[PDB]
Amino acid sequence: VVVLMGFLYMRLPESFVPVEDQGYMIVDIQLPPGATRERTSAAGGELESF
Amino acid sequence: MPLFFIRRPNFAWVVALFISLGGLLVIPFLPVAQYPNVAPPQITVTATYPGASAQVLTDSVTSVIEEELNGAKNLLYFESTSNANGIAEITVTFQPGTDPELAQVDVQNRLKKAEARMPQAVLTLGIQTEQATAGFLLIYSLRYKDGDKNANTTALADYAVRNVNNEIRRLPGVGKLQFFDSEAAMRVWIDPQKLVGYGLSIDDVNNAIRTQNVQVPAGAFGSTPGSSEQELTATLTVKGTLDNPEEFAAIVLRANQDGSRLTLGDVARIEVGSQDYNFGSRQDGKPAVAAAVQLSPGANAIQTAEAVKQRLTELSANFPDNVEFSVPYDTSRFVDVAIDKVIMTLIEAMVLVFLVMFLFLQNVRYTLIPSIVVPVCLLGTLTFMYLLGFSVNMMTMFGMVLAIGILVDDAIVVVENVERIMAEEGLAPVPATIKAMGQVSGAIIGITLVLSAVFLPLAFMAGSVGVIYQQFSLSLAVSILFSGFLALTFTPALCATLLKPIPVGHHEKTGFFGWFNRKFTSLTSRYTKLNDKLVPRAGRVMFIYLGVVVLMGFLYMRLPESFVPVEDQGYMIVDIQLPPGATRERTSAAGGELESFLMAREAVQTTFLVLGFSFSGMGENAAIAFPLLKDWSERDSSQSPEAESAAVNQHFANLDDGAIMAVPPPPVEGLGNSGGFALRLQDRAGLGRDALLAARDEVLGKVNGNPKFLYAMMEGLAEAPQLRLVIDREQARTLGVSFEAISSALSTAFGSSVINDFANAGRQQRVVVQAEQAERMTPESVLRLHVPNDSGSLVPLSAFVTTSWEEGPVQVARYNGYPSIRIAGDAAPGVSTGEAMLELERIAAELPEGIGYEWTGLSYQERVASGQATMLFALAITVVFLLLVALYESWAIPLTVMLIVPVGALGAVLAVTAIGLPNDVYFKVGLITVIGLAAKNAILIVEFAKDLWEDGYSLRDAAVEAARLRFRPIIMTSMAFMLGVVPLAIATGAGAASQRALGTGVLGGMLSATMLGVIFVPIFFVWVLSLLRTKP
Amino acid sequence: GASAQVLTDSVTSVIEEELNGAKNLLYFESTSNANGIAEITVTFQPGTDPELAQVDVQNRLKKAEARMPQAVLTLGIQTEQATAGFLLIYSLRYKDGDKN
Amino acid sequence: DEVLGKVNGNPKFLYAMMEGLAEAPQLRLVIDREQARTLGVSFEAISSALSTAFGSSVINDFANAGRQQRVVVQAEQAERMTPESVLRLHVPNDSGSLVP
Amino acid sequence: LPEGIGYEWTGLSYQERVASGQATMLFALAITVVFLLLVALYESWAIPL
């Protein structure tokens, strides 16, 4: 029993804190370098429509 | 309580394991040090105003800050020094125990109010406020391996700033990083005569540098708001600043339409040099770069020391190959050696006392018990020491090493009592332990309490001595508290468990222990007869005791007083002070002669010299050297720092160019630059600077001729010639010359002007413009300067400027807002400070009315401690008396036993006078410990005496029987403590002064308290109980 | 109007040099952007009271003050207690949803 | 690039990216200091013109309904959208004439 | 990586490293303290084991 405990204890994946459904998400919009604010606005418009 | 542990031994074992576990668990976080934060917290304000004389620096900058710093919370004092190099230093000292962060906070809060009034130059340079941990933990020095005479110290210092200083400053534990050099900057050495030839003024070159070497925040095209069409936002990235000297030489001063250009390089030599040239660092005759690390409060030292050394070692993988690092100055090593010495002594006494018990109990198992109980008490003491935030520092080391023997005494009496019961009544270990502990329970608790009470008042003293006694007395106090608690809980269980039955009548002994038992029964019999012959005559022996106490008083009043004994710290201070007006090169020549002599000496391992820095003050004529000596194992007493100091002072006593003086370091860091006394002579009536110097000459002449003082000097720079420039304002104005033009020309030509910043390899560094070396060495050079008029023509300064030599102060000193003269000195060998300050008060009483004096630092703390000692003694005596009457339910028995105090004081005083040590804090606390242990010895007799006197015996018979019974434990524990502390009295090496200072005093006091105490205590009991007619 | 590198070497690095040696540093991150904004986040060990950290940081910043360009100084620097994470966002809009 | 190739090509990670902005094109302005000085143009004039035209210059404060708010001067949208607009700027010389 | 290119952990990685370090001594201290309290209560060692 104790050797089993050790064997399956050594196989348990580690984690900090389980991820929780906080009710919101993050969306990053990153255009290629040199993109003017208007291109970002158009991309955000497509994103907001979807 | 004890019977419960007799019936439940494993419970006592578990409580033990709990306290021991705590002890082992708290060990790793232990902070180590030499001395605690004995010095009061200090804040320091630095201001840099280039080109300003000391006097104008005093009136225009530091006086402004001095006015505002008044009124801060918890001010003890403030001292301000203005130097001719344009540096103002203000040190504000507060009360000990104030939180440093809030003090620095208040200081900066007031500095912000100050800010509005300073000149724009110092404000562009900035004013720094820092927590002053006076004393450098270590100094790391970088040098070139080959020792080139052409060593470019500027490039090496720049590398140190870029790659080393920031890392070290980031490490945990470094409170401050003081750089003894200057980082790189862009130097522009202008030739004023070339400017005259090209019809240019100095302010013209200043404005050209300012406008042409400027970063350009251009921006980006297509920026928001951006048009709906264009999609290419991109930066414009204009090159504004200049990177290398070649680009700076291309700065255009004047250019015509045809194409001809006058450039900066045509009129000035441009290079990368040091921003500042006030300071220089040499090591063993070779130029080097050095920086000192000052520890942050509340940090481990050994861990921080090895962390800094290891950081230097890992950066060692990255130094240039010609570059090597070293640590010529390091305090931590001393700490290490010291603690090692202490811990080694801690083992020795541990074995020695063990032997002592094996000599008396004559069985290994009986000897074992206290040897197990003691380390438990030590570990608990360490745990409670951490819980109070104390440090593992030398006085605490002395604390626990003397605590060993006071601690062993409870276990000694317990085991010896159970042995005696075992021998007399033959009871089994459990009932015998029950009976013995029932006999000695009340004695043990009363003991623990009275010894705790002898030392508790020491834990309430204030000041620097207050801190010293804090740690020492509190360590001893927690040790004795745990000793009592363990005596009540652990030890009876140990006797109940570990002891073996003895067959009845086995006082027969094969071996010399038979001689010990028989000759010791004979010793107790002779002593019992001596008591028998001594009880009939009691009142007459009182006269012998009165002679004893009067002797104590007489020799106590003749003991010289001292703060802290001077310790061999392994290094010395050498001050180089040439006559006023001396150039850096003369100081360098004198330092070279000094370095040659020091390197000619075997006692010096390495010599570190600083030019421009010293105790007296900052200047070209001032320098300081820190000779480091070899390890104590490689040097004898004739090669000690004191003898080496005498030899250096003797060799150079006839120096023809300047003054040279060797001194030992002060005993306590942060309380001064050296040992001795420091007085501030104060202009309390506004007599004026000339009258101040007259009175200063008076007092210095009076003191320096007095043999009570080894020396006495102005800790500061003496007056120097000045070259006043008489400017005919009317003549200058008539020629069309503005005063601004003269001001700017003089300031930039001689005081050096910082124009703007340039990007050197990613760092913003100053660009400094100054006149060329050959064009500013002589007073004819100031007259050879030219300034522009309103019509654009250049007018020489000689047309309206005349030069006249006067005399003026190169350093100005102010104390508590009044102009002050700082006087420092050291007492002569064999002369205490107290009589010296008394004579100084007598001298100051003769000074003209309105001229004041005040003590500062070490003298202040000494005055407070000398004040507080007597009330300490009174409180201790009253508290022991009150707990004495509480325990015995009587007053007479307390008076009886308190008669034992003067004999222990007698022994301590006689020993310290015989060996000739001063009345230091070490002797003081050793006397206190002797006092407590004499009280314990007296209790050990008087408790059994009271028990037997309540049992129906006659007074004399009861006293005799109790003394006969309890002789063995007293001599037992007494000899144990003597032979346990004898290593202190004979210790040698690092810290040996404090070791011997404790050891001789405690040995003598204990010796008298034992050898005479065993005889006089029954006499006191019989005489007092007869005189007061006490009934059982 | 300052580029990322100009902000980096002219203002950002100047403050970076001075913030070194603060009590209780775990680390510090510095980001210089092309819009002219420089951000420095100094993270300490847990359990330290934030007020002593803030006064120490400003105490070093005033030492720094003497070196930045007059434009930033006229605009001023800001030091704030960063509780990373927003409690809430409140938004104002027009009811009719006008494009103008 | 080496790390992000070993890592973005490593299935142990859902994604790995530069928390930060990638390198962007810049338009360096090579200024002939000698030519500008010969035409009587100070470097201060060029710096001030460029900064105010493109980086926007905050001049002083004005009272808007009792609050002090900045007055910001910047070049018009149509006059700063292309690199040629940089070259179309003019600065004064010592004689009061304007030099492009 | 080439000699001189270093790495460090920040925030969540730092805290996770410290916790993964600390768990084992947490367990050991818990076990020793429960053992000591048990031997205290039962006046024996065998019953605690």
Short mmCIF file of C-alpha atoms in Angstrom, two decimals, chain B residues 164-343:
data_model
loop_
_atom_site.label_atom_id
_atom_site.label_comp_id
_atom_site.label_asym_id
_atom_site.label_seq_id
_atom_site.Cartn_x
_atom_site.Cartn_y
_atom_site.Cartn_z
CA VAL B 164 31.01 46.35 -10.97
CA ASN B 165 29.56 49.16 -8.86
CA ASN B 166 25.93 48.71 -9.93
CA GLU B 167 25.95 44.95 -9.29
CA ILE B 168 27.43 45.37 -5.81
CA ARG B 169 24.97 48.19 -5.05
CA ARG B 170 22.11 45.85 -5.99
CA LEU B 171 23.20 42.98 -3.70
CA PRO B 172 21.16 42.46 -0.52
CA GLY B 173 22.84 44.05 2.47
CA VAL B 174 24.65 47.04 0.94
CA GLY B 175 23.32 50.18 2.57
CA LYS B 176 25.66 52.47 0.66
CA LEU B 177 28.38 52.23 -1.99
CA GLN B 178 30.98 54.98 -1.53
CA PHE B 179 33.18 55.49 -4.59
CA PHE B 180 36.69 56.81 -3.89
CA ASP B 181 37.09 57.89 -7.53
CA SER B 182 35.12 59.64 -10.27
CA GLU B 183 33.30 58.24 -13.28
CA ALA B 184 34.01 59.29 -16.85
CA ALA B 185 32.92 62.56 -18.45
CA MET B 186 33.66 64.59 -21.56
CA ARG B 187 36.40 67.08 -20.69
CA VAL B 188 36.86 70.22 -22.80
CA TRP B 189 40.06 72.08 -21.87
CA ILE B 190 39.69 75.47 -23.50
CA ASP B 191 42.58 77.79 -24.26
CA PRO B 192 41.40 81.29 -23.30
CA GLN B 193 44.14 82.97 -25.33
CA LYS B 194 42.99 81.17 -28.53
CA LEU B 195 39.46 82.44 -27.70
CA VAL B 196 40.89 85.95 -27.41
CA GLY B 197 42.63 85.54 -30.74
CA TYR B 198 39.47 84.41 -32.52
CA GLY B 199 37.36 87.12 -30.87
CA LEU B 200 35.32 84.60 -28.89
CA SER B 201 34.12 84.52 -25.29
CA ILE B 202 33.83 81.51 -23.01
CA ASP B 203 30.05 81.83 -22.73
CA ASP B 204 29.98 81.54 -26.53
CA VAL B 205 31.57 78.09 -26.37
CA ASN B 206 29.23 77.20 -23.50
CA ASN B 207 26.15 78.15 -25.54
CA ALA B 208 27.46 76.38 -28.64
CA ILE B 209 28.00 73.18 -26.65
CA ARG B 210 24.59 73.54 -25.03
CA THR B 211 22.67 74.09 -28.28
CA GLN B 212 24.57 71.64 -30.50
CA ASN B 213 24.92 68.70 -28.08
CA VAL B 214 21.22 68.19 -27.38
CA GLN B 215 18.96 65.19 -27.98
CA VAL B 216 16.11 65.84 -30.43
CA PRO B 217 12.68 64.36 -29.60
CA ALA B 218 11.55 64.47 -33.22
CA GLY B 219 8.63 62.05 -33.31
CA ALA B 220 6.93 59.94 -35.96
CA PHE B 221 5.01 60.71 -39.14
CA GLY B 222 1.57 59.25 -39.74
CA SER B 223 0.87 59.64 -36.03
CA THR B 224 -2.55 59.93 -34.44
CA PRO B 225 -4.70 61.66 -35.56
CA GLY B 226 -3.80 59.84 -38.77
CA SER B 227 -5.58 60.22 -42.08
CA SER B 228 -7.91 57.46 -43.24
CA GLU B 229 -5.65 56.86 -46.24
CA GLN B 230 -2.06 56.76 -44.97
CA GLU B 231 -0.80 53.58 -43.25
CA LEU B 232 2.91 53.88 -42.39
CA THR B 233 3.52 55.30 -38.90
CA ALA B 234 7.30 55.32 -38.44
CA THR B 235 9.83 57.06 -36.22
CA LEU B 236 12.01 60.02 -37.24
CA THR B 237 14.95 59.27 -34.91
CA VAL B 238 17.17 62.37 -35.24
CA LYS B 239 20.79 62.06 -34.09
CA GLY B 240 21.22 64.81 -31.52
CA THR B 241 23.95 63.90 -29.05
CA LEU B 242 27.63 63.38 -29.78
CA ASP B 243 29.30 60.08 -28.94
CA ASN B 244 33.10 60.38 -29.22
CA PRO B 245 35.58 63.25 -28.79
CA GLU B 246 36.03 63.61 -32.56
CA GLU B 247 32.38 64.62 -32.99
CA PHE B 248 32.67 67.09 -30.11
CA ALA B 249 35.68 68.69 -31.80
CA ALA B 250 33.40 69.26 -34.81
CA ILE B 251 31.06 71.59 -32.89
CA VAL B 252 30.91 74.82 -34.89
CA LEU B 253 31.47 78.05 -32.96
CA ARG B 254 31.37 80.46 -35.91
CA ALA B 255 30.92 79.82 -39.63
CA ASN B 256 30.67 82.19 -42.58
CA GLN B 257 28.62 82.07 -45.77
CA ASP B 258 31.60 81.20 -47.97
CA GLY B 259 32.18 77.93 -46.14
CA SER B 260 34.93 78.61 -43.62
CA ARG B 261 34.12 77.24 -40.17
CA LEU B 262 35.62 77.84 -36.75
CA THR B 263 35.22 74.65 -34.72
CA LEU B 264 35.52 73.67 -31.07
CA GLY B 265 38.64 71.61 -31.72
CA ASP B 266 40.40 74.70 -33.06
CA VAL B 267 40.28 76.42 -29.65
CA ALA B 268 40.05 73.58 -27.11
CA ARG B 269 41.46 70.13 -26.43
CA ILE B 270 38.67 67.56 -26.12
CA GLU B 271 38.99 64.18 -24.43
CA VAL B 272 37.31 61.66 -22.16
CA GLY B 273 38.47 62.27 -18.60
CA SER B 274 37.22 62.17 -15.03
CA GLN B 275 34.17 64.24 -14.14
CA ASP B 276 35.85 65.20 -10.86
CA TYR B 277 39.48 65.31 -9.73
CA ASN B 278 39.11 65.94 -5.98
CA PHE B 279 39.84 62.33 -4.97
CA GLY B 280 42.42 59.73 -5.88
CA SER B 281 43.15 56.18 -4.73
CA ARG B 282 46.50 54.35 -4.50
CA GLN B 283 47.33 50.86 -3.25
CA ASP B 284 50.89 49.86 -2.32
CA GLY B 285 52.31 52.69 -4.41
CA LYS B 286 50.28 51.99 -7.52
CA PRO B 287 47.27 53.98 -8.77
CA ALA B 288 44.06 52.00 -8.35
CA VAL B 289 40.29 52.38 -8.12
CA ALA B 290 38.45 51.48 -4.93
CA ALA B 291 34.95 51.49 -3.49
CA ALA B 292 33.64 50.87 0.02
CA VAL B 293 30.51 48.89 0.87
CA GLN B 294 28.45 49.96 3.90
CA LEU B 295 26.08 47.31 5.23
CA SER B 296 22.33 47.73 5.49
CA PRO B 297 20.87 47.40 9.01
CA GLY B 298 19.53 44.07 10.22
CA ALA B 299 21.49 41.86 7.83
CA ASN B 300 23.63 38.76 8.28
CA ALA B 301 27.31 39.70 7.98
CA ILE B 302 29.01 36.37 7.26
CA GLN B 303 26.35 35.58 4.67
CA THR B 304 26.60 39.08 3.18
CA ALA B 305 30.40 39.02 3.29
CA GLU B 306 30.61 35.70 1.45
CA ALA B 307 27.88 36.93 -0.91
CA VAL B 308 29.92 40.02 -1.83
CA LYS B 309 33.14 38.02 -2.13
CA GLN B 310 31.38 35.41 -4.26
CA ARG B 311 29.83 38.13 -6.42
CA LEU B 312 33.28 39.58 -6.98
CA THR B 313 34.54 36.08 -7.78
CA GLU B 314 31.81 35.42 -10.35
CA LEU B 315 32.37 38.82 -11.94
CA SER B 316 36.05 37.77 -11.87
CA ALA B 317 35.12 35.59 -14.83
CA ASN B 318 34.58 38.89 -16.67
CA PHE B 319 37.31 41.36 -15.73
CA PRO B 320 39.85 42.45 -18.34
CA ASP B 321 42.90 40.22 -18.10
CA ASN B 322 45.20 43.06 -17.08
CA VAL B 323 42.66 43.98 -14.36
CA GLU B 324 42.59 42.24 -10.98
CA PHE B 325 40.44 42.76 -7.89
CA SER B 326 41.34 42.57 -4.22
CA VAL B 327 39.87 43.32 -0.81
CA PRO B 328 42.52 45.23 1.19
CA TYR B 329 39.96 46.19 3.87
CA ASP B 330 37.43 43.78 5.36
CA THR B 331 35.97 43.91 8.86
CA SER B 332 34.08 40.62 8.53
CA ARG B 333 37.23 38.50 8.85
CA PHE B 334 37.75 39.85 12.37
CA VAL B 335 34.19 38.83 13.25
CA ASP B 336 34.87 35.36 11.86
CA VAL B 337 38.07 34.91 13.83
CA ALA B 338 36.43 36.32 16.94
CA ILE B 339 33.44 34.00 16.87
CA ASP B 340 35.68 31.04 16.10
CA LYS B 341 37.79 31.87 19.14
CA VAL B 342 34.68 32.16 21.28
CA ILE B 343 33.19 28.92 20.04
#
